[PDB]
Structures are given as structure tokens and as C-alpha cells.
Amino acid sequence: GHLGFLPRKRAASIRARVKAFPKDDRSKPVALTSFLGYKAGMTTIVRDLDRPGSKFHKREVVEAVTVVDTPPVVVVGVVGYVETPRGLRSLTTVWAEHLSDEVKRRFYKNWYKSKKKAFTKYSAKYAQDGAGIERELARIKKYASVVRVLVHTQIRKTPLAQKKAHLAEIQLNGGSISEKVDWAREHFEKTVAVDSVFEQNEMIDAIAVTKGHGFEGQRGYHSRTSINHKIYRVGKGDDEANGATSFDRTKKTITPMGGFVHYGEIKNDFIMVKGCIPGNRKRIVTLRKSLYTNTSRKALEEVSLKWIDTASKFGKGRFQTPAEKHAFMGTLKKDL
Amino acid sequence: RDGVTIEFSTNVKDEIVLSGNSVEDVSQNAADLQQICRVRNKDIRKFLDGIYVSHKGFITEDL
RNA sequence: GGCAUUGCCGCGAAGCUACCAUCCGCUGGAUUAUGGCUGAACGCCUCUAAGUCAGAAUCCAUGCUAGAACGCGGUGAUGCUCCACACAAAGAUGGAUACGAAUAAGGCGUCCUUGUGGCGUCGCUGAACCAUAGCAGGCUAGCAACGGUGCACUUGGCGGAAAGGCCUUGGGUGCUUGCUGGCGAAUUGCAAUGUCAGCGUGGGGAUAAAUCAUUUGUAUACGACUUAGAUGUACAACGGGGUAUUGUAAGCGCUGAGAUUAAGCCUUUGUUGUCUGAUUUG
């Protein structure tokens, strides 16, 4: 096979890492340069599209897709990175002076036996007349060409409960670092939804480790990188009729009847994308937006759904909604 | 570049005058025009219609 | 039900698979031949000698994969206390003494308008420059001068390329060799440097951990890895239920009904039950 990927052995990390970022621009708003999802479930969608000159033009089309569960994510702290003729370097990590439980849980491998004394010095000491982050943060103001921001999920808000929340950082594409740093300073002890982050017809990336199988080198369980995935539908986790298209106009929960395979329903937004999102199921995945300007007739297009698959795909997928399901079944044995 | 005065010449159809100070630069971008017009792959003299530099000289006259 | 080596026809979730299904699969430089620009060599020219503008399926960046198990940064917790006993309360001996840029040229002072300016001058060694006397640097008298210098308090600002460095303000404290005083030194006997670079032990007490173990499954041959385990949507199970596998069940049409159902499906207003062992580290 390719000598691209060498050497052979496993990806040492359960969560992958982000090895690139979109360059930056000084004249933009402060922008959230990337985000990370949870792939939950595979499915298939029918739709039609506008692609002039292609043989599918104005022509009803069917293709499978991938869904990714996406909790709106909560932000604690900022670290600016100085640049040095070696590499970057951190200056100081900062936080929200109140942290959620789970991010506390990231700092203990044994939670129950521990004393939960973690932050008291740092998070308590900031309670005061101030200056807590003043000196350091203004230092970031002076130094630190590039700036990143701590981001961490709420997994109590996901049906798979490990109680423990991951940490990551994301850059900021704004400029004149003051309204960068102030930005997230304003966003300390806050959350940031996916609204202002992405929108449809935008190519991005989501990649992660892939499906550990076993030992016969060691096959799989690598974080590979698959770019160019067109988001068909930007979900909203409060949206009734999850799968409401430009066609269907009937009520369906994107979580099927009886639930997803190994899942409860969807409490937060999601991204449906074509093709494949690497890994095995139940996965935490990385999302990097284009790294550059891709603009072309290919990426400027506009998706038009027909029907989204809400069927329960355990066994052969058959019905869709329990109302229609129970109209076609009619009365069962004990029903009515 | 800078330092090039460009004009689409009137009193002569099908011609253009570029002038300036630096020999290097005026003939630099003149050569750069005649070589964006390269006709390969095909018959060489098929169209002797092409892009040429007709005049090489000064602005003044009588200097 | 069992054997008929997983009993055959038929059904099959799931797991695992298939160019037998689908997705997706980098953007800029540097270049060679080539075409030249400019212009000698060569009083013609010339892509070339100096200098040059484009350009390859290449090379390098751009993007991708890992991440030094003696590569490194950021921050989160407490390492503390007692007793017993051990170091100390790859080569020093004045000073590592800071523009930058050219070298067919530059500093320094200065002139005036502010220059690509004028004037002077410097270099041709750091052999320079500062510092330097006092028992290895004592104890004591003043003369001048308000210095220089130490130390500790101390203002203020700068330095994040490894900043941990530098300046600075303000008092006190000592010093003084800028000047002139007075007492001390031996006997180390004529050399054999003859001086002047808080700290771990091991056993308690306590702080925060981490590990084994246990459970789980995204992992897995062992490893190794990911969850949960402190009184809660904690966990575990039954059942409430929901999908769906299954093809009409003992038995008097009843019945697309039955049996199974997370052990690698799901939501759990209820029920029943559990909730802290050992080991080491800081």
C-alpha cells in the first residue's frame, strides 16, 4: 500500500489531535477556527440538487450519509502562544474561575477516591478585588502573536455517559489581539453554540482514530484524515421534526423508533455529511474548516433535500413514524 | 510594474505604446508581453498575426 | 430437547465483511532544456560573463501520519511536620568590557538647510579600557570633597528568543588610597597551594494523589487503552416499556401469534441491592 502512512503501529491517542489551522485574517470578526463532534449513527438520504451540466442535474438522487452528534460546547480559558525560532510556546493557561464537574473530572483518573481539592488555590484565589488574570492576560495582550482558547464538552448532555469531558483548544481568526483575547475573556464561563460557527454547503473535516480490530502490523486504530465532506444539514438539537426537509413536511425524530443502534435520542444539534466519517461508532471526531479558500462552482452549490431516513435500521428498516407505522399495522394482537 | 506609462495609441489602429525611464523595465514588460503570446503545438507561421514590438526608441526627439 | 462433529429446507437480527455498496483523496515555491530582458567581453551583436523575467510528471515548501520512550513550554494539587544521624550554617583567584552595516569603505566630533552634504579627525591592534596600596589586607588621628563605593531597606520603568537581567529613585549603614597621621606583623626559622569553592539519609505523623484490584467497552493474545464505582438522572438487575429477530406456538377458528432480545439495541417516574479493600509516591 501507500508509504504515506509510516510507521505501522497504533494511534496512541483515543481522541485525535488537530494538526492544521486556517491561516488567519486581521480584518475578520473573531472566529472560531474549528470544532469537534461525536459521530453517532450511519444513515441514507434521498434528495435532489442543482448541478448544471452534470448528469444528475435537477434529478432525484439517493446516497448514504453519516450523522454526528454535536453538543453545544462550553469554554473556560485562553492561552496565547508566543512564537519563537524553535516553535510556538505557551505563556499561561487561564480559566473560568468556576469549572463544570466533568472538566474537574479530567484532572483525576480516580475520581471517587480523590479529595476534590483540585482548583481551590487557583479558582478560589481569583475570588478577590481582582488582578487575578489581569497581569497575565495583559501580558498575552502584549506578546503572543497567535491565540488559542480552551474548549470542553458537556457529556452529561449526551446519552453515552462517561461523566468525563474532553479538553481541546481552538484558535481565533479575528485580529488586533485585543478583541481576540477580550472576546473569549467575555466568553469565560460561557458556552458557544454552533450557530455562528458553520453553515450549510461548507466543506470541512472530521477525522479520528479508526476501529481497533485486533492483532494478527496492527491493523486499524489510526487517526486518518479525510477532507472535503459537504455538510448537507446543520442540525439543531431543539428542532422539532428533526428530519423536516424541503419536501417531506411530516414530523419525524431523527432518532428512529426504539432508538438508534446503541443510542438514546439526540439532545443537541448534529451535522449530517455525505460519505464516510472515519473510526468506529460512538466516536469523538475533529472538524477543521477548509484550511483555505476553496471557492468554485463545486463548493458554491446548494443542497435540496427530499427525504431523511428516520426508519429504525436495526434489522431491515421498514416504517418511519409510529403514527404512520400504527396506521399500516392497524390493531395488533392486544392493541385496539 | 511602476514606472511604465501605458497607452492604447490613437491615430494607429492595432498598436499600443509603452514607455518609461528604465530600458530594463520597459523592454522587460515588453518582452513579458511578447512571451505570453507563445503559439506552440501547432503550425508556426500559420498566423503571423501576433504580438510584436514595432518601435524601439526615445521619447525626445529632438534629444 | 439429544446425537446425527454447529441435524438439513427455510428466517434471521447482530458481529464481521464486498470495486459485489458508498465517500474521499493536497497548493505554492525553487528549478533544467526553451524563449528572452539588459549589456560587455567584442567600438557589430549576443539570454551571460555581473545582473537578470517566465517555466517541469522534479526538489522544497503547502497539506497528511507518527512525535525524540536521556527533545521542550503552559498551568492543576499537596510537598509539610517529629525523632535518630550525615554534607554544609573535564577544572575559578581582578573585570565575559554589549550599535549596526560595508570592507573598491566606516566611526567619532562638529558646521549649517539636513544632506547620499561641509569641515576636522580616527584606525595601520585588546599591548586597549576600566579596576588595582592597607594582617589575604589590622587597629586608630585628622585635612580637604558631598564624591566613589558596599549592604539592606526602596521608588520607578524596561526585558518573554532561554525573559530571571538591567537601569533607576529615595534614606540609613560601612568603606575609603584624593591628602597627612600614629600602633600591630617576626619564631611559619632560606621553597616545597599553604588557604580563603540550608544539605540527604529512615522511621513516624498529616496532604494530595497514583496504582493494583473491580466493573465497563469504543480496545485488546498477553499487554495496553477508554468509562463507572463518595449517596447519585452513581451503579447493577427485574419489570414497566420502545424498535426489531422470529413465522402462528401447550392446549379448547382461539393467534402476523409464539420463543429470544445486548451478553458488541434503546428510555428507564417503579421495584430489589451495592457504595470502599490493599500497595506505593510526592
**DSSP for residue A123:** I
Q: 3-class DSSP state for residue A186?
A: helix
Which regions of chain A does DSSP assign to beta strands (E)? 34-49, 61-70, 73-83, 88-90, 146-152, 167-171, 190-192, 203-207, 229-234, 269-274, 283-288, 303-308
The nucleotide lying nearest A124 (C-alpha to C1') is: C76
How many Å from the CA of A331 to C1' of C1? 35
Is-contact A33 A23, C-beta < 8 A?
Answer: no
**Residues of A301-312 as b/e, b for ≥16 C-beta within 10 angstroms?**
eebbbebbbbbb
Q: Which chain C nucleotides are covered by protein, judged by CB under 7 A?
A: 12-17, 22-25, 27, 35-39, 51-54, 63-67, 71-78, 160-162, 207-211, 218-222, 225-230, 233-235, 241-246, 255-258, 262, 264-268, 276, 278
Can you give the resolution of this entry in Å?
Answer: 3.7
Residue closest to A242 by CA, chosen among A268, A260, A262, A263: A268
CA distance A98 to A188: 9
CA distance A319 to A258: 12
Residues in chain B: 63
Is-contact A297 A267, C-beta < 8 A?
Answer: no
Name the one residue in this structure whose C-alpha cell is 458556552.
A191
The nucleotide lying nearest A223 (C-alpha to C1') is: C65
Domain annotation for chain A: domains and CATH numbers: 1-71+193-210+220-336 (2.40.30.10), 72-192 (3.30.1430.10)
Q: 3-class DSSP state for residue A284?
A: strand
